[PDB]
Amino acid sequence: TLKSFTVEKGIYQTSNFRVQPTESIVRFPNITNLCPFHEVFNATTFASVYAWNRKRISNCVADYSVIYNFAPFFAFKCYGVSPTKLNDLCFTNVYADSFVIRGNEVSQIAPGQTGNIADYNYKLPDDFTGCVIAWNSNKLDSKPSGNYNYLYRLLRKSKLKPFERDISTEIYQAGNKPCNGVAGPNCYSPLQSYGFRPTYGVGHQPYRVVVLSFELLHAPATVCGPKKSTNLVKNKCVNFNFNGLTGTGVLTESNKKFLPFQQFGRDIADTTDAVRDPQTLEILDITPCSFGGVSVITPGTNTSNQVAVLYQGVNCTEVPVNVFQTRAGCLIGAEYVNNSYECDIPIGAGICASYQTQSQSIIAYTMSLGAENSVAYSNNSIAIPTNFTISVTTEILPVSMTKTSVDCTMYICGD
Amino acid sequence: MSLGAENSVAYSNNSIAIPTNFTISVTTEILPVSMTKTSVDCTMYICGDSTECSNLLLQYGSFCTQLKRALTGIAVEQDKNTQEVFAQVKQIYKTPPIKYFGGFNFSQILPDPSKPSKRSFIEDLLFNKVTLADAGFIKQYGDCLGDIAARDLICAQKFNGLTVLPPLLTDEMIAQYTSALLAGTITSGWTFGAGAALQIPFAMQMAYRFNGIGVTQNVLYENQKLIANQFNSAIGKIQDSLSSTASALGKLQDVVNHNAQALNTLVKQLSSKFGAISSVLNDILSRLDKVEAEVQIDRLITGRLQSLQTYVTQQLIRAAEIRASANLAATKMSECVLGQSKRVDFCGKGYHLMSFPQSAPHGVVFLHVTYVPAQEKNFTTAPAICHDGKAHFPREGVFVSNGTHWFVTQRNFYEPQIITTDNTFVSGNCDVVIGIVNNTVYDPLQPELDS
Amino acid sequence: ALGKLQDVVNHNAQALNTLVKQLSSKFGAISSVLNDILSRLDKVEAEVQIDRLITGRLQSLQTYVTQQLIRAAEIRASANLAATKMSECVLGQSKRVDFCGKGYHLMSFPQSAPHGVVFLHVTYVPAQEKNFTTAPAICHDGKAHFPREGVFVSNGTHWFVTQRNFYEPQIITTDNTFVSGNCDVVIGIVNNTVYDP
Amino acid sequence: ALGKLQDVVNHNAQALNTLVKQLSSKFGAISSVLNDILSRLDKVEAEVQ
Ligand SMILES: *[C@@H]1O[C@H](CO)[C@@H](O[C@@H]2O[C@H](CO)[C@@H](O)[C@H](O)[C@H]2NC(C)=O)[C@H](O)[C@H]1NC(C)=O
Ligand SMILES: *[C@@H]1O[C@H](CO)[C@@H](O[C@@H]2O[C@H](CO)[C@@H](O)[C@H](O)[C@H]2NC(C)=O)[C@H](O)[C@H]1NC(C)=O
Ligand SMILES: *[C@@H]1O[C@H](CO)[C@@H](O[C@@H]2O[C@H](CO)[C@@H](O)[C@H](O)[C@H]2NC(C)=O)[C@H](O)[C@H]1NC(C)=O
Ligand SMILES: *[C@@H]1O[C@H](CO)[C@@H](O)[C@H](O)[C@H]1NC(C)=O
Ligand SMILES: *[C@@H]1O[C@H](CO)[C@@H](O)[C@H](O)[C@H]1NC(C)=O
Ligand SMILES: *[C@@H]1O[C@H](CO)[C@@H](O)[C@H](O)[C@H]1NC(C)=O
Ligand SMILES: *[C@@H]1O[C@H](CO)[C@@H](O)[C@H](O)[C@H]1NC(C)=O
Ligand SMILES: *[C@@H]1O[C@H](CO)[C@@H](O)[C@H](O)[C@H]1NC(C)=O
């Protein structure tokens, strides 16, 4: 810590000690069902863009590593999560959306985007977490005469709020005259067909889009995947895993009055203070494992190589990862003597340490304020000096320091 | 707003006002000396137990070593402040078991051995009035490990890597130093601060103190019971004011409150995202892949490092202020307690006589005993007196007249005396002083020579 | 003895050494050498890495300047104190207790030191002490006599008057005492004779 | 003679002028004007700037 080979007399804060964990705990709900990605990722016909189907997925084990064999897509484009980490963590609710768009509008399926699909047909929230899966479907959604099954809504009266669906088909008016259900002057039908052909370019091919949205709430985890559960171990420094969140600490029984809808207890510094077991209906505490500071008390290396160690703020029967217990921690390597000298190395609340010859060893003592005196006071007694001494002392005061100038362009950049 | 009452002093070129009585007043001065010592583990605060965060934190260089050095320097400086204020005496003087200091009652400021802590009545009142946060200088991880009732603020502060260190001198040692200074001040006077303690009776020490402020020492010996009663009533008023109102100790309460509030802000800054997707490091580590979690973790590292740097800079500025106040308290202990100070409005308002230190949490309390003139009266004055073609000037004093006869009296108390050649001196004649008057000057040799 | 001036030297050396050592850090970039970043990457990516290095080095330089400002405040407070000590101890005689050394101040001498000043304070310390019996006043012919500038002491049989800081006993005389009132009000007045020359 | 009080005035004026002039810097973004950033780009890129 001092980056040197000789140290001077004093007390130095070197490092910090910590109790290492010894066990790993994984706590997951007992779910055996398998999530039906098979019934979603292939179909004869997907739904249209204006009338997209929403499928609720709950209470199953979700394997996301199988999705690659099911459709020929390149990118498993996720936003709030990562595709490779979808099995470790786990969710509350999963929703699946299905529609077929043109390849020009694949980039419109993203949070904070506008256009034609994103403004009228399918709008994503700004704080969206989840994955968007899209792949080419020229083989199944193209005809030489033209595929008119898929339709998109051209324009609306106002912009669409996120995750909303519009089915009703009323004739739009952009003027003063009423249309009266007849597409005459200034009257347009809102729905227009894609009309897919195999002779089209690479940007106008049909594209099947499946959007998986993950609900990351504080509710009990209804749907999540295959993690092997571990038996519950209490009163030990463990590495727990409660429904996908990791941590390190001890788990104890609690007397907190959790309401039946409450699952977690939060701290002021926004960390999980209490947790509920997903298998049994019992709440637990999370207290971090034992730690503190370590200070090394030494004389100079030209005197001795002996040291004493001070574990600050630790009851000394709890020490491991001469023993004397002070109010600043406990001291290992220095013996307490029933004497009082001047303070040499300051430790704590009235305790000092020194290197004394009574074999040389490091001792700890209570510091002495000075000699005891009692002036002989009386109501008719005075003391008057008869001589004098002339004493010359020395006072040292700093006045000025080194003047420096820094060239910031040469420091930061250097030509 | 009102600046005060309007006053108009009746000024004239031959009118003077001289006090005929006095009061003994005891005031109270409160000064902060030291503040709470803290140490911060930057690795546990920024990261905790995350090894990826630690390996990303090592790329920032020595932004932790110099924060540690600054906090260590502040912690050493606080103990130096307490040592330079209180440890100004070489020996622990003891007061005698007899408690007759000339009728002055010092029982409220002297220690009582019946208490487990040898502190006076006023020191106990001062320690009870300044409420404390009960910081973690006493060992506290045994209390934090046992989850009883709710979670305290200090347990969260300790869990997040913020540690409070205990001061080197305990409150018993501060009270012992204060008791030694008090015992030396009553028993010896100012002699114990300039060498060895020379004993003197307290009445004669007070006569020396009155000679310091310009009053003849016969004023004390003829008014010893009145001065003792005034001192006792002033000490009782100090006791009643400290028992009733606790708003005087706002400086020490602010010293406690600022250091609680800064640590609370430092803990509350861990809930912030700083532009990342989560404030929890484990959620970022278990939610995204290596590169993107590295990006979010670096954003969190930058935010937490900035908040820690802001805390250290504010602590350095507060340490500069506290060191200035401790230097002032050391000067006041050297000059008010160990001696008698002629500087105006230093050592209390009035004419300073004595002072007494009293220990308080995070500071010191001075009880300044001063002399205040009370009841004045109008007179007629002259600069000199013409007598036999000579101009007489007073040696120490002032010429006053009660309408018909001319006297000479000292300035700070009305004690009129016959004008004599012993208390006057001659310089020149009567043709140069403006405002001279005609009067006779007594000669003590003539009636002794004629008899 | 000169540890204060030694610490003034040491802090200003250590701050510059830390500022030099801070140039070897990466601050999240792929390298700390700037030419390696410029040669190994194109314009946009090297702009990103250089921006990280610029932010880190600018923050370290700001930390150095703020620390220098606070140390300058401390040094200016100490220099103001040394100027007051030069004006009051060297250029005069000071009645302030524990200013200008411990004892009763007589003289002071300045000496120049690196980054500071050294004061040699010449003081007066009483040495050898003696117990005496004392009194506030002395009754004589129904009058109370107080000392002019001194204190009444007794060697056991005779009564003298002496100065307070040096044992120089003298005969009690109406020249060195003054009269105020009778002997019925002072607590502790003793009976003795007062010499009339 | 009153250069100390003049310096007390001048330091405050210079500090506030520097604080106003610091609003014209880009700090690595594409523009120092906030509405120009908000109109030129979409949500994510403007959030970075
Ligand atoms: C000087 O002031 C004191 C009080 O400051 C006066 O003492 C008071 O006298 C009255 C009348 O005798 C008593 O009722 C009070 O109890 C006294 N106060 C005490 C003893 O604290 C004193 O009389 C004044 N002297 C002159 C000459 O006016
Ligand atoms: C001014 O003070 C003098 C001295 O005390 C007063 O003179 C005395 O007055 C009383 C009362 O009348 C007489 O009994 C004394 O004989 C006087 N002493 C003398 C003349 O030496 C004088 O009355 C005072 N003048 C005032 C108050 O106007
Ligand atoms: C106290 O001091 C007086 C003054 O000197 C001492 O009296 C003298 O003592 C010497 C020594 O015997 C005699 O020669 C003188 O004749 C004495 N002079 C007078 C005027 O008495 C006295 O002895 C001292 N007492 C003590 C106890 O020290
Ligand atoms: C899961 O475990 C809980 C508690 O042991 C039990 O009540 C529940 O019936 C279990 N569910 C299944 C499907 O086994
Ligand atoms: C697509 O899913 C359907 C659903 O039953 C299944 O019959 C079909 O075999 C799947 N396609 C392939 C290529 O496996
Ligand atoms: C929902 O109702 C509001 C009425 O405030 C209307 O403006 C909006 O278009 C409706 N949305 C759908 C999808 O029907
Ligand atoms: C904690 O330390 C105190 C102080 O010595 C002691 O009384 C107590 O028993 C300790 N707690 C333990 C050992 O659990
Ligand atoms: C003076 O001191 C003696 C002994 O120390 C004591 O007996 C006496 O009471 C004191 N005088 C007064 C007036 O109390």
Ligand SMILES: *[C@@H]1O[C@H](CO)[C@@H](O)[C@H](O)[C@H]1NC(C)=O
């Ligand atoms: C002194 O005061 C009186 C009354 O106020 C005045 O008449 C007189 O002129 C003053 N003396 C001088 C020298 O002005």
Ligand SMILES: *[C@@H]1O[C@H](CO)[C@@H](O)[C@H](O)[C@H]1NC(C)=O
């Ligand atoms: C001194 O004051 C205390 C408390 O005010 C009182 O109890 C005590 O009697 C006083 N001392 C004397 C000698 O009267």
Ligand SMILES: *[C@@H]1O[C@H](CO)[C@@H](O)[C@H](O)[C@H]1NC(C)=O
């Ligand atoms: C002195 O005289 C002035 C004016 O005559 C008067 O206002 C004042 O009350 C008198 N007394 C004192 C004590 O100043």
Ligand SMILES: *[C@@H]1O[C@H](CO)[C@@H](O)[C@H](O)[C@H]1NC(C)=O
């Ligand atoms: C004072 O006396 C002298 C001589 O006796 C005389 O000349 C002078 O006028 C007198 N002064 C006053 C003010 O009466």
Ligand SMILES: *[C@@H]1O[C@H](CO)[C@@H](O)[C@H](O)[C@H]1NC(C)=O
């Ligand atoms: C004075 O008397 C006290 C007690 O009677 C004694 O301890 C001391 O040694 C004597 N001498 C001096 C010089 O103080």
Ligand SMILES: *[C@@H]1O[C@H](CO)[C@@H](O)[C@H](O)[C@H]1NC(C)=O
């Ligand atoms: C002093 O002398 C007077 C009379 O001469 C007498 O009344 C008094 O008692 C004496 N003092 C002592 C202490 O004996």
